[PDB]
Write a protein that binds this ligand. Sequence first.
Ligand code: FDE
Ligand code: FDE
Ligand code: FDE
Ligand code: FDE
Lengths: 452, 455, 451, 454
Amino acid sequence: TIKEMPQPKTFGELKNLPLLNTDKPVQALMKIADELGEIFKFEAPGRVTRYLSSQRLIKEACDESRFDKNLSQALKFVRDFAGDGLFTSWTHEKNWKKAHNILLPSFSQQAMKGYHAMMVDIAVQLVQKWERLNADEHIEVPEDMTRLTLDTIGLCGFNYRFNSFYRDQPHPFITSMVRALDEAMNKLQRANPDDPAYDENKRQFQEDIKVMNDLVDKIIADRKAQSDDLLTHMLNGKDPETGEPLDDENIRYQIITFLIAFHETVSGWLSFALYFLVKNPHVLQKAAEEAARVLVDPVPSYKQVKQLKYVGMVLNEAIRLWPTAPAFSLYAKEDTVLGGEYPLEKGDELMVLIPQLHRDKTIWGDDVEEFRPERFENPSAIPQHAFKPFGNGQRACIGQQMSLHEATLVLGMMLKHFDFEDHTNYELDIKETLTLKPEGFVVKAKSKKIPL
Amino acid sequence: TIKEMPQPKTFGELKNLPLLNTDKPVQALMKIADELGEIFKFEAPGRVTRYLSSQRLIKEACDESRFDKNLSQALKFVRDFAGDGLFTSWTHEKNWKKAHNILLPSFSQQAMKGYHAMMVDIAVQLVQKWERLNADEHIEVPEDMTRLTLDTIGLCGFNYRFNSFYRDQPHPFITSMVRALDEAMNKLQRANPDDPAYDENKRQFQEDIKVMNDLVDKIIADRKASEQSDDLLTHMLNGKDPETGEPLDDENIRYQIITFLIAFHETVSGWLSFALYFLVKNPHVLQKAAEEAARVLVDPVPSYKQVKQLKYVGMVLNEAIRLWPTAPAFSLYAKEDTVLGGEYPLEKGDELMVLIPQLHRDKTIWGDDVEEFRPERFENPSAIPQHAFKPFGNGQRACIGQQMSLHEATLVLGMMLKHFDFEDHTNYELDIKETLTLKPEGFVVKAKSKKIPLG
Amino acid sequence: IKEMPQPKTFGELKNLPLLNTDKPVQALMKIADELGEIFKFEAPGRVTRYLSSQRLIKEACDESRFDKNLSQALKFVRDFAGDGLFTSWTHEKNWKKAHNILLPSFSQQAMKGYHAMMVDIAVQLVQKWERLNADEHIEVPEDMTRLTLDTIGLCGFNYRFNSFYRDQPHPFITSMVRALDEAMNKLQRANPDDPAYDENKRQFQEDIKVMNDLVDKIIADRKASSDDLLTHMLNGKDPETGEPLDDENIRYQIITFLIAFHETVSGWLSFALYFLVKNPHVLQKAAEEAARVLVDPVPSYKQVKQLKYVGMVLNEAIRLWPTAPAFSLYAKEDTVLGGEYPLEKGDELMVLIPQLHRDKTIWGDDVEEFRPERFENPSAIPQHAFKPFGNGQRACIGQQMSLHEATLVLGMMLKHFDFEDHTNYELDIKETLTLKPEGFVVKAKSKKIPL
Amino acid sequence: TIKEMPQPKTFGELKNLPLLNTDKPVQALMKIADELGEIFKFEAPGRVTRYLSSQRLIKEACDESRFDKNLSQALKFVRDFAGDGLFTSWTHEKNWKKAHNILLPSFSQQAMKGYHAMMVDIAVQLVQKWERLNADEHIEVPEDMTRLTLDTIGLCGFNYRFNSFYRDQPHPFITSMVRALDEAMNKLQRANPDDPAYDENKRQFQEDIKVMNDLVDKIIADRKASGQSDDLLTHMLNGKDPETGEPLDDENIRYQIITFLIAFHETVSGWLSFALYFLVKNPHVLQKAAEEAARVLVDPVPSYKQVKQLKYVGMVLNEAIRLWPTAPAFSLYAKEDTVLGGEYPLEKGDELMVLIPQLHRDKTIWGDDVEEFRPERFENPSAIPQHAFKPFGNGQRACIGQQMSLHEATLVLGMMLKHFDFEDHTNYELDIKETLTLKPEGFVVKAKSKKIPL
Ligand code: FDE
Ligand code: FDE
Ligand code: FDE
Ligand code: FDE
């Protein structure tokens, strides 16, 4: 011990729990970090956690020999419909390392080449929908990104077609997922989960899990009707220590896991980029420039997607400022001291506020709020563990290459084919589920009249 | 001659445990037993045991003068909620032989005739439900068998009505109970029962045992109040052991009540469920039993006598329990130092595991056509070799409810054949749910009512 | 400081039945995958530990702690390869002796003289493929065996095997290949005295006679009417003890060199060519490099050192399937390996090179993909992560020579032909003690470039 | 199964107190443990505790995320003269962490090398004393062990010479300390702290704290009269807490000395006395032990390295403290509400008592030969289950002095076998003296010198 850790305003037996009684919890934790600094204690009725925001402390917390991935209270609630899936499993749980080693092949750079084609299929549907709009209309950006990202993960991953672009009120599954995800966040604020007022909520949630298990558990049977896809790797892959493939119910947990994490992270990710592009018109220019120069075929090639360097940089700079999955949690593998100042008991919890990490002024310089993609011209100059939008270590985001490819591909095609107007002067408003997307974001797009 | 025993792949300090890190250990120990042969050593961190697969070795192990019933690690974990009840007590502990002797009267034939009435009650309810289904509806068999057996044991044993058929969601008591058995199973494989993944499991486990104890304490209240009662339960209360004179302490009563509920409802559901599977997949066998049904059940409701007629139905049930004994294994320890089968020396106290499924697949005893389902193997039961067919355990520690069960399945299985035709409308691939017991999972059928009325 | 994993045990026969296959090395890889970076492998009367991670492999290559061990495998090769360079103890008298007598033959200096005869053999192969009719095809490992054997026989010993003038394999190659087949098979044998194996032993005894009768033929053809590997054996004297090699040891070095070269380099070329037809972008990328640099009818020593992508292809092939897949080490004194595994002095280690070359922590998550671009900055490669040629003073003396031969040959093949995997060949790895693809066939269309 | 806790007979408003109105409670609680099994509740007027006997439950009770060290009612009374010394302080008491991180350097293996020389000196005095005995004279083992352990802790700890071997009548200092412990233990057992029967006690107790504080301030003053030793005492005067203050205040130091002196001389002597008991009672072991001493103690005086090489001797000592842990118990409280062993709910703050002697007798862990003295159990010390053997406590509050004590027991016991043959000439029946620590009462032997010189 040397240093007593700061802690924000406390409400008697309710601790600092009321501090996140916003619809914007993450943003509130930022507002607290901005005033209390690199670390602060955050107490709830049944739990206590420490939030880290400086690259200095995060570098220590990302030591895989001292800390492991913890299930935050948030992820504990997602465990009720995502169960034992990669995102919500403990490292030492039996299905993590099992599922982790079988699936890494399906997201290696080699796997992308196969996903590329179906990736494009959904990508044209989006382009066609925008081309077919009449002039007086506009684009509802998050909604169309959700349509795309879900149809892409559903098609490329499992060869199931959601056909979101053929419907206006969202898919029952997606509406159920979002309402299930919303319930997980809504619980965080209940200091009385037994209270009867939450019976309709507990009812609806239970009905929503049935909706997901319905479609998904049908899909596992609907394929036993084999191609080379994510589901086939799950049905056919073998674990070398017991020799068994994945549990039938565990697969149901992974599919649910992959559908949500992809559709929620990637759609938010694309939306944020587009905001920054229409708000930074010169960056928009140079980005459409490379887009026009590289996207030389009626359809993109896998090689060409890699040859977008500035579109990728806008993507990196977007996820820096608003990382769509804003936080991960860790626990102390053993007793240890953090930053030489804060001692930790075995089992103590840490929360990394990725947005606040990504604003650490000593690391990125004093223009941390400016959208300047050229910070990524020399990616090796960026310090180890200063930029962790995909988590850390073995528990790092398994789909970051799939995601980058999709975002790069789609963003490239958008820049080739349209010019974008911030016709309403949209002020950035962040919707918070557990993930982050912008809300009501709308643009108008004038077609560059180019065929596919 | 004194030959060393095979042992499968071993890891670090955690020994052979990762080999059995599945949701279907018995099916895995089988696929291991098939690989290593009749006997192999299986070490887990801090415990050592031998798994047996040949009748040759089992005949030696069923000598009650050399081996006594041992509590497997599995049973040590169910003892966490079944305590020293009949299933999970040491045969030398005081409460075993006390309870064994006070309760044994309640399961001989003479007692069965008394239960027959309420057994039919619960069965008519099942048939009544299957009659009352709409045309394109289906039957979830394991789930409806679960409703049946729990309703049957609780009424015959305890004059308590679960009224499971009056529910869609399983009785909450069953939900907790199944998760408790599932937890005992999972605790077997835990590579580190410490680290935090397992803290909610601790929560759930205790929460579920409390659930079971409450309705048990409600059954005991329901009787302190409600009667001319020839029960498992009256023999438990008023019954006195004729050797030391006293009756059961309350705690042991509670463990016996839970014990009886669980074992009946789990093994007997699995049995009937499997029986239907093999019948629907071998239709001439279904035909053969389906006429024994029509031929013997000539009154609107079966009589006790009619159940013993159904010889083939018993034969069907036997061949099913042979293939998948729902209690797939029992454990033994060496009373003293010995050599097993002349090849393997063992120190006193070494534990043995009988993989009843693997015994029941022995080719030297059953022939080369084992895995085929032919109920005709059980027609001269005296022709069946001694110690080759042990689905009901062994010796004085054998299943006390064997005849009650055989009577139960045959009656229920008989009526099902009398009143319905069964369609495997899904071409169901067999999926064995493994708690500690076995039973088919997701098994569904369609049933055509033969439109015969009931009483 | 922890206990080591171990595969399935069969009582008194220990782990021995696990390698009662025809492909033990590939079988040790499957075991490694289930048990990880280290596992104990016991047979009755023998114990060894298999290592798979660069983390532990870096330790086992510390030459102050561990020395080259003769695995049970090499001990059987010693029955016809004796005290030759490969099957010698580091302390044996003839090792250090022969090492210094022979090292002059593998310096860069020596290579430049060999290049002329190396080209000779390569032209024979090209002439043979060009002279094929349209419907015909190439049996790849067989033609690589014709090449490599003729090549070392020419450079090392100025002896012409004239393999390309034959349809039936060379008798030497047959006896020699089953001598390795027997050495490998003797390893898994539970009952070595049984009448089942009596015919194998007459046959083994006969294979050694065939090999020695040819070696005796080579020496007389020289002692007839040349600054080569053989003269250095006959005339060279050890600067440390003063004497040349005994006649006995000469026989073993000749046998050793013919076998080691022809077997490892046959496998290498075949695997390289295998990967080339399976990754056609690499085929194209490498195909052009030949045309750009190999501009004269026959390559110059300098030109081959310029074929860099080709060299990279070759390196990426020996990374995936190292033709000598293992070497063994023993602990010089009591020690602890990796802070986890205490070792008494004399305990044996086995380096499973194919599994080492798959350590993702070093090579990344795409280890199984054939990507020669990993070897652009070879200095970027961590030490002890890429060890196809062994380690330290006991490392392969014929290393740079092989790379030269493989590159010379691989380039000319790319210069002069286009190859079709007309069979969609599935990779089948034959195992003696070395590795080799077995049923590999392709078609080649001549580019009509003359020689 | 979430079980009702057994509890022995309760006597009116006096609860279970009449059950321990004996002179040997630990020995009695073992008897209770045997009838009621692995756990029972024990209530006294104002106290409730749960006594644990099984490895099953102890494995849970030593989880430091659930339980913290409690001041047992005993330790609450010892605190009356040990104050906030290391033994009788709460973990959250400021001075505990302060003293712990300041003093831990004095028990590192780095430190034993320094203590070894002075440890030997006291040990030689013991050898010389036994050698210079006349033929009829026998040896009273515990009394000599006390002389040894106290002279050694004072010399190593504080560079102060008690010179106990120059006395036959006990130190005024030690009799006061021994009587203070005996009183704290007995004041635990009294129904009425009001009765006039206890006035002489209340007089003597307050008088004995007076002597202890006297002698201790002499030690703290005698070093000022010197200014140069690198010992426990210099570490207390010079060590500063790396946490927020600098040095140890002069009052807590007054308590660390009392704590160390008492903790060493009572546990470490009783341990040695016990080690000798089993050796004279199991001659096969003694033969084996002398064997090892004769081979290893190859210098006229033993060296620090040689001591490490005395394995079997370490085995017997470990086997002795297993059978009779001289500090027989420690106490724990619940940091929050929890369930113990899945059966017994505990409210936050509820107290537990670990009966180290009964745990070291758990058949499931050690086998059915619990009572027989077989030092061969400890040749694979890493094979022994975790938390089945806790003679030096548990966790952050485990005995700081294990390293040193074992160094003493090995050193002293080793020479005894080097230089003497031992006869239980009286056929001594084991009688266990119980203060808060344990110790044989009246153990006597005769020793024949092997005539080996130094
Ligand atoms: C499919 C997919 C897609 C995606 C995307 C994404 C984006 C854009 C972003 C992101 C992120 C992330 N992730 Fe992500 N993702 C995914 C996924 C995933 C999974 C499965 C996971 C888990 C793995 C492990 O760790 O185990 C993740 C994971 C992840 C993470 C971590 C978590 C924790 O808690 O630690 C993060 C931070 N992810 N992400
Ligand atoms: C009620 C009931 C019913 C039944 C059924 C049955 C079926 C179906 C099958 C069976 C089985 C069996 N069991 Fe059975 N069961 C019963 C029961 C029982 C009991 C109580 C027991 C224990 C007994 C004694 O002896 O104690 C049994 C028991 C039994 C056994 C053995 C166990 C041991 O561990 O040894 C077996 C194997 N079971 N099981
Ligand atoms: C001639 C020749 C050729 C060759 C080639 C080759 C290839 C391709 C690959 C290889 C390899 C090798 N090698 Fe080799 N090679 C040779 C050789 C040799 C010799 C002689 C040896 C031994 C040396 C010494 O040191 O002694 C070798 C050696 C060698 C090795 C080592 C082994 C042990 O045991 O350790 C290895 C790993 N190799 N290799
Ligand atoms: C000097 C010294 C010496 C010694 C020794 C001994 C022997 C022989 C035995 C013993 C023991 C013991 N400890 Fe002992 N010791 C000592 C000490 C001590 C101290 C200071 C303590 C407290 C610590 C803390 O941190 O808290 C102890 C501590 C101790 C313990 C714990 C108890 C409680 O409270 O928990 C035990 C059981 N110890 N011990």
